[PDB]
Design an enzyme around this catalytic site. Structure first.
Site, PDB file in Angstrom:
ATOM      1  N   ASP A 286      -7.944  -7.652   0.289  1.00 27.40           N
ATOM      2  CA  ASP A 286      -7.055  -7.723   1.423  1.00 27.40           C
ATOM      3  C   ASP A 286      -7.903  -7.608   2.679  1.00 27.40           C
ATOM      4  O   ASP A 286      -8.907  -8.291   2.877  1.00 27.40           O
ATOM      5  CB  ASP A 286      -5.935  -6.682   1.387  1.00 27.40           C
ATOM      6  CG  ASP A 286      -6.395  -5.304   1.723  1.00 27.40           C
ATOM      7  OD1 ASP A 286      -6.728  -4.490   0.862  1.00 27.40           O
ATOM      8  OD2 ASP A 286      -6.420  -4.982   2.944  1.00 27.40           O
TER       9      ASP A 286
ATOM     10  N   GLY B 218      -0.625   6.179   2.871  1.00 31.18           N
ATOM     11  CA  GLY B 218      -1.560   7.240   3.089  1.00 31.18           C
ATOM     12  C   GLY B 218      -2.674   6.963   4.068  1.00 31.18           C
ATOM     13  O   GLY B 218      -3.029   7.822   4.856  1.00 31.18           O
TER      14      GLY B 218
ATOM     15  N   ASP C  51      -2.576   8.351  -2.589  1.00 35.82           N
ATOM     16  CA  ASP C  51      -3.839   9.075  -2.666  1.00 35.82           C
ATOM     17  C   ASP C  51      -4.080   9.809  -1.367  1.00 35.82           C
ATOM     18  O   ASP C  51      -3.379   9.673  -0.351  1.00 35.82           O
ATOM     19  CB  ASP C  51      -4.997   8.127  -3.000  1.00 35.82           C
ATOM     20  CG  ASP C  51      -5.251   7.054  -1.981  1.00 35.82           C
ATOM     21  OD1 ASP C  51      -4.359   6.772  -1.171  1.00 35.82           O
ATOM     22  OD2 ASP C  51      -6.350   6.399  -1.986  1.00 35.82           O
TER      23      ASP C  51
ATOM     24  N   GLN D 277     -11.197   7.259  -6.174  1.00 32.32           N
ATOM     25  CA  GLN D 277     -11.863   7.980  -5.164  1.00 32.32           C
ATOM     26  C   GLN D 277     -13.194   8.552  -5.647  1.00 32.32           C
ATOM     27  O   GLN D 277     -13.688   8.251  -6.733  1.00 32.32           O
ATOM     28  CB  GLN D 277     -10.863   9.006  -4.597  1.00 32.32           C
ATOM     29  CG  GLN D 277      -9.696   8.324  -3.906  1.00 32.32           C
ATOM     30  CD  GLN D 277      -9.994   7.584  -2.615  1.00 32.32           C
ATOM     31  OE1 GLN D 277     -11.093   7.589  -2.103  1.00 32.32           O
ATOM     32  NE2 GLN D 277      -9.007   6.874  -2.051  1.00 32.32           N
TER      33      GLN D 277
ATOM     34  N   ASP E 274       0.857  -1.182   0.000  1.00 32.92           N
ATOM     35  CA  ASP E 274       0.000   0.000   0.000  1.00 32.92           C
ATOM     36  C   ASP E 274       0.904   1.247   0.000  1.00 32.92           C
ATOM     37  O   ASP E 274       2.144   1.210   0.109  1.00 32.92           O
ATOM     38  CB  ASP E 274      -1.016  -0.070   1.110  1.00 32.92           C
ATOM     39  CG  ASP E 274      -0.406  -0.104   2.475  1.00 32.92           C
ATOM     40  OD1 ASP E 274       0.747   0.336   2.633  1.00 32.92           O
ATOM     41  OD2 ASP E 274      -1.104  -0.620   3.374  1.00 32.92           O
ATOM     42  N   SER E 275       0.259   2.427  -0.132  1.00 32.83           N
ATOM     43  CA  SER E 275       1.035   3.646  -0.296  1.00 32.83           C
ATOM     44  C   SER E 275       1.453   4.332   0.996  1.00 32.83           C
ATOM     45  O   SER E 275       2.291   5.224   0.995  1.00 32.83           O
ATOM     46  CB  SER E 275       0.180   4.682  -1.050  1.00 32.83           C
ATOM     47  OG  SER E 275      -0.575   5.267   0.013  1.00 32.83           O
TER      48      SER E 275
ATOM     49  N   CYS F 141     -13.216 -27.915   6.172  1.00 36.62           N
ATOM     50  CA  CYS F 141     -11.937 -27.265   5.951  1.00 36.62           C
ATOM     51  C   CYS F 141     -10.803 -28.269   5.812  1.00 36.62           C
ATOM     52  O   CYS F 141     -10.703 -29.164   6.670  1.00 36.62           O
ATOM     53  CB  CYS F 141     -11.678 -26.305   7.140  1.00 36.62           C
ATOM     54  SG  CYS F 141     -10.098 -25.415   6.918  1.00 36.62           S
TER      55      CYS F 141
ATOM     56  N   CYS G 142      -7.352 -28.005  11.109  1.00 34.36           N
ATOM     57  CA  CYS G 142      -8.583 -28.820  11.215  1.00 34.36           C
ATOM     58  C   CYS G 142      -8.315 -30.310  11.098  1.00 34.36           C
ATOM     59  O   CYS G 142      -9.076 -31.136  11.560  1.00 34.36           O
ATOM     60  CB  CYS G 142      -9.577 -28.310  10.176  1.00 34.36           C
ATOM     61  SG  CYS G 142     -10.254 -26.681  10.604  1.00 34.36           S
TER      62      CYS G 142
ATOM     63  N   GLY H  14     -11.613   4.184  -0.801  1.00 32.86           N
ATOM     64  CA  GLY H  14     -12.571   4.986  -0.084  1.00 32.86           C
ATOM     65  C   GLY H  14     -13.771   4.230   0.408  1.00 32.86           C
ATOM     66  O   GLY H  14     -14.707   4.876   0.928  1.00 32.86           O
TER      67      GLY H  14
ATOM     68  N   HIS I 230      -5.806 -21.402  10.226  1.00 33.00           N
ATOM     69  CA  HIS I 230      -7.145 -21.828   9.817  1.00 33.00           C
ATOM     70  C   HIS I 230      -7.848 -20.707   9.061  1.00 33.00           C
ATOM     71  O   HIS I 230      -8.468 -20.927   8.032  1.00 33.00           O
ATOM     72  CB  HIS I 230      -8.001 -22.318  11.018  1.00 33.00           C
ATOM     73  CG  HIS I 230      -9.439 -22.380  10.585  1.00 33.00           C
ATOM     74  ND1 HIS I 230      -9.910 -23.402   9.784  1.00 33.00           N
ATOM     75  CD2 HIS I 230     -10.460 -21.493  10.801  1.00 33.00           C
ATOM     76  CE1 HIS I 230     -11.203 -23.120   9.569  1.00 33.00           C
ATOM     77  NE2 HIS I 230     -11.543 -21.988  10.143  1.00 33.00           N
TER      78      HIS I 230
ATOM     79  N   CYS J 116      -7.540 -27.553   6.049  1.00 29.45           N
ATOM     80  CA  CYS J 116      -6.296 -27.006   6.549  1.00 29.45           C
ATOM     81  C   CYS J 116      -5.697 -27.928   7.586  1.00 29.45           C
ATOM     82  O   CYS J 116      -6.327 -28.836   8.159  1.00 29.45           O
ATOM     83  CB  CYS J 116      -6.495 -25.581   7.110  1.00 29.45           C
ATOM     84  SG  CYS J 116      -6.948 -25.454   8.877  1.00 29.45           S
TER      85      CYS J 116
HETATM   86  N1  LIG Z   1     -10.737   0.739   2.578  1.00 27.18           N
HETATM   87  C1  LIG Z   1     -10.079   1.777   1.774  1.00 27.18           C
HETATM   88  C2  LIG Z   1      -8.578   1.684   1.895  1.00 27.18           C
HETATM   89  C3  LIG Z   1      -7.893   0.812   2.668  1.00 27.18           C
HETATM   90  N2  LIG Z   1      -6.520   1.023   2.523  1.00 27.18           N
HETATM   91  C4  LIG Z   1      -6.417   2.055   1.635  1.00 27.18           C
HETATM   92  N3  LIG Z   1      -5.107   2.580   1.216  1.00 27.18           N
HETATM   93  C5  LIG Z   1      -5.203   3.562   0.365  1.00 27.18           C
HETATM   94  N4  LIG Z   1      -4.058   4.099  -0.067  1.00 27.18           N
HETATM   95  N5  LIG Z   1      -6.389   4.089  -0.124  1.00 27.18           N
HETATM   96  C6  LIG Z   1      -7.613   3.621   0.247  1.00 27.18           C
HETATM   97  O1  LIG Z   1      -8.674   4.088  -0.187  1.00 27.18           O
HETATM   98  C7  LIG Z   1      -7.610   2.503   1.214  1.00 27.18           C
HETATM   99 ZN   LIG Z   2      -9.241 -25.280   9.075  1.00 24.74          ZN
END
Ligand SMILES: NCc1c[nH]c2nc(N)[nH]c(=O)c12
Ligand SMILES: [Zn+2]
Ligand SMILES: NCc1c[nH]c2nc(N)[nH]c(=O)c12
Ligand SMILES: [Zn+2]
EC number: 2.4.2.29
Lengths: 348, 348
Positions: free
Chosen positions: B256, B95, B132, B179, B92-93, B284, B289, B206, B315, B286
């Site tokens: 995620d 932000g 963002d 966005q 992720d960035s 399951c 289990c 968002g 699990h 795994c």
């Molecule tokens: N649930 C929205 C979200 C989670 N993580 C995020 N990370 C960034 N950069 N932008 C996003 O809009 C989101």
């Molecule tokens: Zn399991």
């Protein structure tokens, strides 16, 4: 396999190497037993415990009787099934952790010879410890005598309780515990009393309680020869790598951020490891040392991450198992004296 | 393998299944990405993460830049080497976690388009997220517009930063983030702007910010069709099994004491599980289990034992991976509608 058979394959001075055969497996001696507290070796699956080379683990009766409870574990199939370890388990008697009172036993806020042996039966223990009365360190001769004598009465009670339960008597083993503090005459009386009752193995109790290594070794020098030679000798609550080597030199067979290395322990949290790409130990064959750096484990432990605990514990137990293997091989090869010398020159 | 190639193998309504090919591996879509916070998927070795079926994991830039630090991870060989995961990593960035300010970026107490892209480069990320500006929920139209517009300016800056680093441009992929809050016109403008700049994949940003499932799905209904059809669609910060199924129905490709089961979640700490010998989930596949009971895991979690966290996490991630596999197979077989109906009837 038999219920219990201890065989000595090789000796060097007072040191011995051999095997304990039991229904659930063979135990190579000298042995190190990882400790399961509340039915888990901390941060390891049982298969990982086994992969390190452990043959047997220790379970703590005091903690299991409180949570989840002994009757409950029995209803669920016993400790081995519950936690997924199918090899031998040694259970302590619960007495030590109670301390850390009467002739019948102890009551406490969150046990007797009979109740301790029963709990160990409900857990399905392979090696059951007699219930003893803890002797603090230091202890005066009068108090050490009184507690030793009580422990010997309780050893007979433990014997008789175990024997009166057929399934337990036929499938498990019972070890007695020598007391007597640091006093040679009391250790002798205690050995004599335990040998007269007769056990499958003999623990040296009451040490590693604050007396320090020199004193512990002095007491082991006279105390271990008093025990039957043809049965295993278990030093309870020991210990550090150097303590293990010296205790094997004195005839002991069984034992129960800091990372062990053959150059001595390191504290992985120290800043000097933040960019160290080497494994925890340069020779260690464990999976942790194969795959991850000091720098990564430094980060994990300082971040409070569970994987840090997982990796450190697997390495440390593997290190201990490698130590035990090197001890066994050197005794069998008649070069344990040299191993112990080489070990100390480098570890220190 | 190529730097990046997304291929759609089968469709059912808006749902798609296919593959992303990258230099470090193939990602099967729809995909669920376990999250690595501070360079570890909590309580799992990377090999265990892989054994569950995960093809790719998420790394959090905000946390890594603080501890252990981006430059330090680069000096040690990059994130993959550091933590021992050799397959794709999406970063992720930074932000979002900053929030949970100016046109140049944000300063905070323990980042810019350029610095975020640089940190992701220092980590060695395979899929890099544009930087963002977070839009809270709810947001007025004026504020949602202002933040969306800033995010689009920052998307261009992110593009240009990534492209100006040859090694990154040649070996990694860059995703843009749509966005616009819950407003259709703003989502359209944002999609248009991102498509005009051009990215390897498109996230819906968002959402999952407090609007609730009905509202999220309403926004996905109009927002996902606005994105290029031939690139992956990533719904950030989602989620729950039911959210995943409905989001795939709307054209999303990437995502995620509580244990997931096909009959719904259970809280394993509840007293009703104290003597329940069944596995966490009855179907399951795994390893957890296969080997341990609800009763044992109940005990471990109530005792605060690390193995409890290990087993629950393995699990749960395995459950999510089995969900994703059943989604992929049902879409490829043209029976995803029926799967989604069957899934909901039972999970609820
Ligand atoms: N649930 C929205 C979200 C989670 N993580 C995020 N990370 C960034 N950069 N932008 C996003 O809009 C989101
Ligand atoms: Zn399991
Ligand atoms: N270090 C001594 C020791 C540890 N655990 C013990 N448990 C019992 N029952 N007796 C003992 O003497 C000891
Ligand atoms: Zn190691």
């Amino acid at each position: 396999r038999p219920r219990f058979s201890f065989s000595i394959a090789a000796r060097e001075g007072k040191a011995r190497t051999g095997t304990i055969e039991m229904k659930r497996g063979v135990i190579r001696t000298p042995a190190f037993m990882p400790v399961g507290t509340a039915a888990t070796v901390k941060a390891l699956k049982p298969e990982t415990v086994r992969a390190t080379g452990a043959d047997i683990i220790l379970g703590n009766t005091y903690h299991l009787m409180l949570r989840p409870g002994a009757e409950r574990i029995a209803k669920l199939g016993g400790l081995h099934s519950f936690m997924g370890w199918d090899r031998p388990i040694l259970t302590d008697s619960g007495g030590f952790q109670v301390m850390s009172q009467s002739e019948e036993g102890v009551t406490f806020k969150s046990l007797s010879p009979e109740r301790s042996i029963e709990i160990q039966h409900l857990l399905g223990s392979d090696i059951v410890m007699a219930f003893d009365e803890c002797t603090p360190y230091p202890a005066t001769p009068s108090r050490a005598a009184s507690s030793m004598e009580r422990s010997m009465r309780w050893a007979k009670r433990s014997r008789d309780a175990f024997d009166s339960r057929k399934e337990q008597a036929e499938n498990a083993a019972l070890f007695g515990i020598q007391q007597g503090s640091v006093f040679e005459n009391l250790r002798q009386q205690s050995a004599d009393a335990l040998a007269e009752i007769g056990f499958d193995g003999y623990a040296v109790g009451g040490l590693a309680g604050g007396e320090g290594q020199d004193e512990m070794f002095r007491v082991l020098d006279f105390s271990v020869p008093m025990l039957p030679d043809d049965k295993p000798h278990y030093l309870m609550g020991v210990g550090k790598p150097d303590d293990i080597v010296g205790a094997v030199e004195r005839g002991i067979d069984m034992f129960d951020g800091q990372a062990f290395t053959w150059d001595g322990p390191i504290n992985i949290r120290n800043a000097r490891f933040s960019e160290d790409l080497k494994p925890l130990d340069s020779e260690c064959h464990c999976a942790v040392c194969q795959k991850w750096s000091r720098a990564y484990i430094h980060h994990l432990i300082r971040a409070g991450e569970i994987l840090g605990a997982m990796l450190m514990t697997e390495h440390n137990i593997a290190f201990y198992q490698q130590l035990m293997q090197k001890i066994r091989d050197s005794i069998s090869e008649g070069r344990f004296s040299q191993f112990a010398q080489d070990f100390r020159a480098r570890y220190f």
